[PDB]
Design a protein around this ligand. Structure first.
Ligand code: SF4
Ligand code: SF4
Ligand code: FES
Ligand SMILES: [Zn+2]
Lengths: 95, 114, 688, 208, 82, 48, 126
């Protein structure tokens, strides 16, 4: 789930890759530029957006006191999804 | 506005103590270059000694001159013993340039120091 | 003699009658904690934090809006005062979400500080915690209304300073949404100021939003640029670099406010900058080199060139130091055709004679004024804090503000008198129902905009307005001494250039074509290469060049305003100095340092080495440019108006208009605002 | 109040108050302040002349033994004409009480070398001479303790910054360790943590 | 060559400054009427010695005083400069 | 861990590459940040 | 013992040990720290902070950091009065700039005039 630079190496999840007129590419010579090849942007889209049958709902993140604190988010956007800033995952409503 | 002086009343005893300290440092150097096995002739060492004396040559408060006498006498004790090793006596010199000049033009090509 | 004793904790102190309890406690040093009080707005009482147990009464009363009766005794550290504060603080923290990690005011909250220093240590209210869905107010201000404590401070600020009236309370009970009902993009001036009004993390900056947290930065003195008034600005800096700016307070000018362009300008200040000194090349191209090649080429051409063939257009945001260095250099070669950016006319001796090229009154001094006429300008879009000052006077006491020159969007019912210089000579004659208001009112002020002076009607309108000034000054007995007349400006570096006694405008180049010229920030359509001989040799010295950099012959990467200890003058003659915050990226030396190195490399010298010697020469040339944060108005209006009678010009019949009229022209036509993307975002948001 | 708060003992408060009032009324020549804290440890604030008579009086006299001497630190305070503070600390073997003898001093005028009456102050005087610059008059041996020899600058001052002015490194050109002016590897962010809103109302000093 | 700049530096309470005030209320309009090319300029800040400077001839800033002078003496000295 | 081996997480490596110092395959540090100040590009289009 | 003492200036820059460039080049600034406007509290006022001008802070190219050759860059000295501030800055040697203190000017605000009758002061919302 990574891209690859036109220089011929792996870019990160941040577009921080080098130009042709640098030297930190040549201090990358011989030893492998490590990159976590499992990103975080695309793992959101593989999650099912839950459709909770209430109005204003809660979020903890899989476990009491193991995760992020209680955030109660609103679902009044009739076509947009309410997004937890901690979880990063979406919700809907179905009366 | 009453201040207890350290050693001297007026600048006379201050001048006397500082020229006494300079006499001691003059007769103290070749013992150091014979003992610590330095790498510098006697002339250059005596010239930087008189340079360091001439650097602070414009201070007229007798308390400050007495306190610099105490500083120089402490360093003279700790160099006439074998405590301060080769590193500190070479550290008094500046051969590890730092050739940073005092022009305007060369200070302009290596900037941010007006 | 009109003083009432209050016993703050037994300590007696005298208080002017009618003022609040809270100002008495701030007089003795106490801070009763407050959330809906502010020292610039009207005093609502909606936050309940300001409570205090006044003795001999069973009921705790407020102190935000309490009038002072005779001989109080105020207990700020009693038992039920602390119990009331702990109770109210426990009430506030119920329907407020857990966002203190991700909230953009971790170091600069108010609930956090007052909850530590006055609140409880345990909570309650196991269920509940309602949530309000956010809005989309604008691309400048990020908005999460869940953290809104409904304190009614953005509303009072909008309705009493912005004058826009696009914010409101909606609903009852817990359900009181503070916001805008019609999904309208709230766009006005001073909307950047609302993110410091909001005491909780509910109205934050959109482009800044998640880039720092206010304990890591360090705060640094600086001066506002691109506005003629100069609010005092504090840069929160980080990483040998920036983070953001904030307004800090001068009492007289620009009290606790700032302009949106200043508050959101720094993205363009670090976007397309210049790090290389650049010389043209044999294909016709522009490459870069070291300083020796560039300064050697400029020094060789300068030693070859003398006569009246050397010009220096210095506009944009230049320094007192760079202009002093350039004037000394250009005297030292032979002679000059210095020019500035905006063409100021000189027919009644306007370069000298301190009156006719600064703001003769004080910006704070306009509150005691009574009748203000306003000849062509647009104060909402030209130094908006001046317009906020005029609205402050219009809201506190009575005024009479009339406008001659444009039907525009001013917020406070100007009296439109028409747009032609025939109206101006007609009020010079005095055939109005408004000349009577002028010459038989008490304290008159005439504000001339500098943007209506670039046209060919310059010296005539200036002389006629000065004749109005002489008329109402020598008549009606006012005061003495106090001033009807003043002009304003748009760019502070032009004010410093006029203070140093320069030739204003490119009229000297149009009368005399040069062969070598120094462009110190040529912003707009001053000169081209078609209007100039073909061996041009421009030396453009600046930062993020987008005009002049296409017209480049030698580029010298000058520093920016946050990057040097400059010396600027506002539009009223007060000299304010910038301070060192961020060292410039790349090679990028300071401007007067580059000029003195140029005079070193060329076969000459300059008799100074340090910036303190530069400021010594600055006090030599002009005396009030080192007396920091000081004002002294001019005099000799009789001599000015009698010298305004030599060149007898005409007054054209065309209607005038300021180009600074709407949102797109407030945001485009300056360098730092042009170089950004936040300005482009809000431009396309307002046009679309 | 009754849990979670350390109580105070007003018996010892009254006793130390009466004792400090006694000492202050029987040595009028050098006493300015005898202040008692909430936690009942005495502080006696003294002009820098009677150091030797006050210490000889407080070693003996059999109404207060105080044979035990502890630390001496002269904590550096700007916005005072006489800056530094010599803090003697005295402990009685018979009585279980602690008195902090704070005499003030300036940058240059010496206090009178308490090593003659308390033998435990020898390295204390030598160390505070190295770290501050408080000279001691008619002291046997004044050298540098807890610094390098060639170093100078009296580093526990407030004018001396956190990072020093020197930075050692070995090099092979001159085959030894040399000092260069300091080059950090990270900025040492000194954060802004002084929050407003007056957490202690009982310590509001009277303003101007 | 000729002149380029003439500068006047003043204050509020001095007999020479009062004499230059007398000169500048009486005899400036005919002077500026006479020489339309010389920007002779006036400066008052808060307090400074009332100095009269002339910047001309390729970087010559010649200096004279106007302290404790009478207005006729100011006019005579300025014509000696000009 | 024959009693409860796994976890219900789909990111754990199938290799468990051990301490790899003194190899051609180890770690080097660098700046995980994009462009700082974005230097200016001269125009390729000429004049004169 | 009440000796000869003269009443003069001080020259402690010879004894503080810091070299000449950091003595005479950098210029101090004595200022009252302004109120951080996103909060509203003047407890952080009432002191005179002495700081120095900032200097170069480049990028250490191995980690993306901010190194500097500036020992004096990270000082602040909290003072009680401007007089002892200037006395200290002239005692210890280096050149300096002193600003003055700015206070909130006392206004006269009143809810009853915020609900006026024939004036233009009117809250229009409450
Ligand atoms: S405004 Fe922000 S920092 Fe303050 S209590 Fe609310 S969430 Fe926390
Ligand atoms: S948005 Fe902010 S300023 Fe407006 S009422 Fe809510 S908390 Fe107050
Ligand atoms: S200040 Fe908010 S209630 Fe008085
Ligand atoms: Zn969540």
């Amino acid at each position: 789930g990574v891209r690859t630079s036109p220089t011929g190496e792996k870019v990160t999840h941040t577009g921080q890759v080098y130009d042709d007129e640098d030297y930190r590419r040549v201090r990358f010579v011989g030893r492998q530029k490590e990159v976590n090849e499992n990103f975080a942007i695309d793992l959101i889209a593989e999650q099912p957006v839950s459709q909770v049958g209430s109005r204003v709902i809660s979020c903890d993140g899989g476990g009491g006191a193991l995760g992020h604190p209680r955030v109660y988010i609103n679902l009044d956007k009739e076509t947009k999804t309410g997004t937890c800033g901690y979880c990063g995952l979406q919700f809907r409503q179905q009366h | 506005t009453s201040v207890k002086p350290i050693f001297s009343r007026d600048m006379n005893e201050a001048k006397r103590r500082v020229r006494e300290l300079y006499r001691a440092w003059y007769r103290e150097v070749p013992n150091t270059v014979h003992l610590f096995q330095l790498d510098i002739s006697v002339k250059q060492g005596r010239d930087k000694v008189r340079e360091m004396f001439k650097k602070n040559a414009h201070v007229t408060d007798p308390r400050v001159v007495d306190l610099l006498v105490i500083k120089g006498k402490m360093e003279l004790e700790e160099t006439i013993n074998v405590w301060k090793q080769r590193t500190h006596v070479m550290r008094f010199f500046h051969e590890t340039e730092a050739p940073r000049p005092k022009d305007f033009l060369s200070k302009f090509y290596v900037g941010h120091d007006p | 003699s009109n003083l009432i004793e209050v016993f703050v904790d037994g300590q007696s102190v005298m208080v002017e009658p009618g003022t609040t309890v809270l100002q008495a406690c701030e007089k003795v040093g106490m801070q009763i904690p407050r959330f809906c009080y502010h020292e610039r707005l009207s005093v609502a009482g909606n936050c309940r934090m300001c409570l205090v147990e006044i003795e001999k009464a069973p009921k705790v009363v407020a102190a935000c809006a309490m009038p002072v009766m005779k001989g109080w005794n105020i207990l700020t550290n009693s038992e039920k005062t602390k119990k009331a504060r702990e109770g109210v603080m426990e009430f506030l923290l119920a329907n407020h979400p857990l966002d203190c990690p991700i909230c953009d005011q971790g170091g600069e909250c108010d609930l956090q500080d007052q909850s530590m220093m006055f609140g409880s240590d345990r909570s309650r209210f196991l269920e509940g915690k309602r949530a309000v869905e956010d809005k989309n107010i604008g691309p400048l201000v990020k908005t999460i209304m869940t953290r809104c404590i409904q304190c009614t401070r953005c509303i009072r600020f909008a309705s009493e300073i912005a004058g826009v009236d696009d914010l409101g309370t909606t609903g009852r009970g817990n359900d009181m949404q503070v916001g805008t009902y019609i999904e309208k993009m709230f766009m006005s001036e001073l909307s950047g100021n609302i993110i410091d009004i909001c005491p909780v993390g509910a109205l934050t900056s959109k482009p800044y939003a998640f880039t720092a947290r206010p304990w890591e930065t360090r705060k640094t003195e600086s001066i506002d640029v691109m506005d003629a008034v100069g609010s005092n600005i504090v840069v929160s800096t980080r990483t040998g670099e920036v983070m953001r700016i904030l307004p800090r307070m001068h009492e007289d000018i620009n009290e606790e406010w700032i302009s949106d362009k200043t508050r959101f300008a720094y993205d363009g200040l670090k976007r397309q900058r210049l790090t290389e000194p650049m010389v043209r090349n044999e294909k016709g191209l522009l490459t870069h080199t070291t300083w020796e090649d560039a300064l050697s080429r400029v020094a060789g051409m300068l030693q070859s060139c003398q006569g009246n063939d050397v010009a220096a257009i210095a506009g944009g945001l230049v320094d007192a130091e760079a202009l002093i260095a350039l004037k000394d250099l250009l005297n030292r070669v032979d002679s000059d055709t210095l020019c500035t950016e905006e063409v100021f006319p000189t027919a009644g001796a306007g370069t000298d004679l301190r009156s006719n090229y600064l703001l003769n009154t004080t910006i704070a001094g306009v509150e005691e004024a009574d009748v203000v006429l306003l000849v062509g300008t647009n104060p909402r879009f030209e130094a908006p804090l001046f317009n906020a000052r005029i609205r402050k006077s219009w809201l506190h006491n009575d005024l009479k503000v009339a406008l001659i020159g444009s039907p525009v969007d001013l917020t406070y019912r100007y009296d439109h008198l028409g747009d032609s210089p025939k109206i101006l000579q007609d009020i010079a004659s005095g055939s109005h129902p408004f000349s009577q208001v002028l010459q038989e009112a008490k304290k008159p002020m005439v504000v001339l905009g500098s943007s209506a002076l670039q046209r060919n009607d310059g010296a005539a309108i200036l002389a006629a307005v000065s004749n109005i000034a002489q008329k109402i000054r020598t008549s009606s007995g006012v005061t003495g001494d106090w001033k009807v007349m003043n002009i304003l400006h748009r760019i502070a570096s032009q004010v410093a250039a006029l203070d140093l006694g320069y030739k204003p405008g490119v009229e000297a180049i149009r009368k005399n074509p040069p062969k070598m010229l120094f462009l110190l920030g040529a912003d707009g359509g001053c000169v081209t290469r078609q209007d100039l001989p073909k061996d041009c040799f421009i030396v453009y010295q600046g930062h993020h060049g987008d005009v002049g950099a296409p017209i480049a012959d030698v580029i010298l990467p000058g520093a920016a305003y946050t990057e040097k200890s400059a010396t600027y003058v506002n539009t009223e003659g007060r000299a304010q100095q910038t301070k060192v915050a961020v060292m410039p990226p790349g090679l990028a030396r300071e401007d007067w340092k580059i000029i003195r190195a140029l005079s070193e490399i060329a076969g000459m010298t300059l008799p100074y080495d340090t910036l303190d010697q530069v400021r010594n020469r600055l006090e030599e040339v002009s005396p009030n440019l080192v007396r920091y944060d000081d004002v002294e108005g001019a005099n000799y209006f009789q001599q000015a108006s009698e010298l305004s009678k030599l060149v007898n010009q005409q007054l054209l019949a065309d209607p005038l208009v300021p180009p600074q009229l709407t949102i797109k022209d407030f945001y485009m036509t300056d360098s730092i605002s042009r170089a950004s993307q936040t300005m482009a975002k809000c431009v396309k948001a307002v046009t679309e | 109040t009754r849990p979670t708060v350390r109580p105070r003992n007003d018996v010892a408060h009254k006793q130390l108050s009466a004792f400090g009032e006694y000492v202050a009324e029987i040595l009028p020549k050098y006493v300015q302040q005898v202040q008692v804290s909430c936690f009942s440890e005495l502080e006696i604030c003294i002009h820098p002349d009677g150091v030797i008579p006050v210490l000889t009086f407080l070693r003996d006299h059999s109404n207060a033994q105080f044979k035990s001497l502890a630390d001496l630190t002269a904590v550096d305070i700007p916005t005072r004409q006489n800056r530094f503070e010599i803090v003697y600390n005295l402990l009685s073997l018979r009585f279980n009480s602690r008195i902090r003898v704070k005499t003030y001093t300036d940058e240059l005028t010496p206090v009178e070398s308490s090593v003659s009456v308390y033998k435990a102050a020898n390295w204390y005087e030598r160390e505070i001479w190295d770290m501050f610059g408080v000279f001691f008059a008619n002291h046997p041996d004044l050298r540098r303790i807890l610094t390098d020899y060639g170093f100078e600058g009296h580093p526990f001052r407030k004018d001396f910054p956190l990072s020093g002015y020197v930075e050692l490194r070995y090099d092979d050109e001159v085959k030894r360790v040399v000092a260069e002016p300091v080059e950090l590897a990270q900025e040492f962010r000194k954060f802004d943590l002084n929050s407003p809103w007056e957490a202690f109302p009982a310590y509001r000093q009277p303003p101007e | 060559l000729g002149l380029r700049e003439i500068r006047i530096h003043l204050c509020q309470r001095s007999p020479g400054s009062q004499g230059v005030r007398d000169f500048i209320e009486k005899r400036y309009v005919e002077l500026k009427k006479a020489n339309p090319d010389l920007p002779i300029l006036i400066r008052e800040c808060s307090d400074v010695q009332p100095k009269l400077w002339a910047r001309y001839a390729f970087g010559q800033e010649k200096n004279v005083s106007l302290n404790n002078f009478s207005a006729d003496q100011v006019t005579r000295a300025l014509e000696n400069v000009l | 861990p024959t009693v409860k081996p796994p976890t219900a997480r789909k990111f754990i490596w199938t290799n468990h590459k051990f301490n790899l110092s003194g190899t051609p395959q180890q770690y080097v540090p660098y700046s995980t940040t994009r462009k700082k100040i974005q230097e200016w590009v001269p125009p390729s289009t000429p004049y004169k | 013992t009440q000796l000869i003492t003269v009443d003069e200036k001080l020259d402690i820059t010879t004894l503080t040990g810091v070299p000449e460039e950091h003595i005479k080049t950098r210029k101090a600034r004595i200022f009252v720290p302004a109120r951080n406007n996103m909060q509203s509290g003047v407890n952080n006022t009432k002191k005179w902070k002495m700081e120095f001008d900032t200097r170069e802070r480049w990028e250490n190219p191995l980690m993306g950091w901010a190194s500097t050759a500036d020992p004096l860059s990270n000082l602040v000295l909290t003072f009680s009065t401007k007089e002892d501030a200037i006395a200290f800055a002239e005692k210890n040697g280096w050149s300096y700039d002193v600003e003055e203190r700015k206070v909130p000017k006392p206004k006269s605000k009143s809810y009853g005039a915020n609900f006026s009758w024939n004036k233009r002061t009117r809250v229009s919302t409450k």
